[PDB]
């Protein structure tokens, strides 16, 4: 849901720029225990409503793993790197799934974000970071869920450059 990002430091907003036409994204998440989760998403603006259409293919998740055993405890906050590749926006991130016993299971997200606008109408951002926090509440067992996210797009201000670079 990449329309909801707080951009700081004068970084251009690839997703908001894409309207009215909208954008798509595509991703494969590779899990360290052999699982794969692949997705394609279409984002459109319809009146005053954003409309998401998602297709999912997941495979090779170990039967004894936290995913198939339904014993996962949600995601840690995460950091994504984003930069231009082939005239579109690429995203890479590592995430860590909380497991029983204070353990974590890591995965890597391989993303391509694709505006439906032509390149001529877009300001492509420089290399930057996106901080994410996703929090989920299971309201009804395997049926109803609530999800909260906060996202901020920024440069590295915490570890400053001595040469005035970002």
């Amino acid at each position: 849901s990449k329309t909801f990002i707080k951009y700081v430091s004068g970084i251009p907003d690839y997703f908001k720029q894409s309207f009215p036409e909208g954008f798509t994204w595509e991703r494969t998440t590779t899990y360290e225990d052999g699982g794969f989760l692949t997705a394609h998403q279409d984002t459109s603006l319809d009146g005053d409503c954003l409309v998401y259409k998602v297709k999912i293919l997941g495979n090779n998740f170990p039967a004894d793993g936290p995913v198939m055993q339904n014993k996962a405890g949600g995601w840690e906050p995460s950091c994504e790197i984003l930069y231009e590749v082939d005239g579109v926006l690429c995203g890479q991130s590592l995430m860590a799934l909380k497991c029983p016993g204070g353990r974590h299971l890591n995965c890597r997200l391989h993303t391509t974000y694709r505006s439906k606008k032509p390149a001529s109408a877009l300001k492509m951002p420089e290399f930057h970071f996106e901080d994410h926090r996703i929090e989920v509440k299971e309201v009804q067992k395997g049926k109803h869920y609530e999800q909260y996210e906060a996202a901020v797009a920024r440069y590295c201000d915490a570890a400053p450059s001595k040469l005035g670079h970002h």
Partner: protein
């Protein structure tokens, strides 16, 4: 966009041979970078796997 924007979602998928469908409804602050949504599993429930693997898709 406006300081509060609603969104709808439809999702269909297969995970480890399990077919499912979900719908979603939420809203957030586009410029402040915050959002909330509700997801219901409408087909293939109760989900036979951790919903967490679906979070980044929602």
């Amino acid at each position: 966009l406006t300081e509060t924007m609603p969104f709808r979602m439809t999702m269909e998928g297969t995970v480890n041979g399990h077919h499912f469908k979900c719908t979603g409804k939420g809203e957030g602050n586009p410029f402040e970078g915050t959002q909330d949504m509700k997801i219901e599993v409408i087909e293939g429930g109760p989900l036979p796997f951790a919903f967490d693997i679906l979070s980044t898709s929602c």
